[PDB]
C-alpha cells in the first residue's frame, strides 16, 4: 500500500510525539535527533551532537511528563519545517510548567523524508 | 561612515522584532511588505489556520484591526538556521485596541531580511 507523503504538519506533529516520548523514556538517546550544525538552547546555545548530548544529560531528565496543548508546523526555507510547540512539562515529579519550544527540522540529506533537528529552542514561561 | 561586522543572529532577530512591533503600531497596513509568496502567517484566533502569501497576509492583518497597540517584549532569542536564515522565538504581552493585555508565544523565520514564517499564538486560546 502506497500513500502520498506526509504534510509539514504531519511531519511536525509526528516529530513532537517522538521527541517528548523519548524525553520521558530514554533522554540519553535524544542526541540522535541532532547533527553537526544543530543548535540547542534549553543560556548559551550548544552545537553538534556531542555537546547537545552533554547538555541534555546535565539536565537530569527523570520521569519527564508532557502535555502538548498546541503544535503549529509550517514548510520553511530549503525544504525545512518550522515547528512551534506550546505545552506543559514536568521533570523529577515536580509541578507542570508552561513552555514554548521552537524547532527547525531540516532534511537530513542522506535519506528520503528523513529530518534532523537544526534548531531546538525551549523556554519556560515562569522564568520569563 | 564605516564598515561594521555583520550582526549576529541575535541582533538581527532583536532588531527585526523591534521594527515589526513598531510598525504593527504605527502602520499595520505596511506589515505585508515583510512577506513573500511562500510566506506563512497566523495571529491567534479560534485554533485558526495560517494564510500564505503577501496578498492574503495583508488581508488578514487588516481584518485584525491593529490600533493603539501596547507591546511588551519579555524575551527574544534568535539563532542561525538553514541557508543563513534566522529563527526567532518571541515571548511577551500584546494589547490591541485598549483591550486586555494578553500573553503570546511567537516564532519567526527570517530569510536573507524578509519573513518566511510568522507564527503567533495567544496563550489564553491554547492553555
Residue numbers in the entry:
A (entry chain A): 1 to 42, 52 to 137
B (entry chain B): 0 to 45, 51 to 116, 124 to 138
Q: What's written in the study?
A:
Ras GTPase Activating Protein SH3 Domain Binding Protein (G3BP), a 52 kDa protein highly overexpressed in various cancer tumors, has in the last couple of years proved to be a significant cancer marker protein and a potential drug target. G3BP is involved in several cellular functions and is implicated for example in stress granule assembly, RNA metabolism and hereby cell motility, nuclear transportation and NFkappaB, Ras and Wnt signaling. In addition to the PxxP motifs, G3BP also contains glutamine- and glycine rich regions, an RNA recognition motif (RRM) and an N-terminal NTF2-like domain ranging from residue 11–134 in human G3BP1. The NTF2-like domain forms a homo-dimer with each molecule composed of three alpha helices (αI–III) lined up against a beta sheet made up by five beta strands (βI–V).
The 3.3 Å crystal structure of G3BP1 was solved in space group P6322 with one molecule in the asymmetric unit whereas two molecules describe the 1.6 Å structure in space group P212121. In addition to chain A and B, 289 water molecules and one glycerol molecule were included in the model. The structure was refined using seven TLS groups to a final Rfree value of 23% and structure validation showed good overall stereo-chemistry with no Ramachandran outliers. Chain A and chain B are almost identical with rmsd of 0.453. The difference in resolution and space group between G3BP1 1–139 and 11–139 can be assigned to crystal packing effects largely caused by the N-terminal residues. In the G3BP1 1–139 structure, residues 1–4 are accommodated in a hydrophobic ridge between αI and βII of a symmetry related molecule as shown in Figure 2. The N-terminal residues are held in place by burying methionine residues 1 and 3 in the hydrophobic ridge. Furthermore, a salt bridge exists between Glu4 and His79. Despite being a probable crystal artifact, the binding of the N-terminal residues to a symmetry related molecule could indicate a possible ligand binding site. Although it remains to be experimentally validated, we speculate that the G3BP1 interaction partner, Caprin-1, might be recognized at this site.
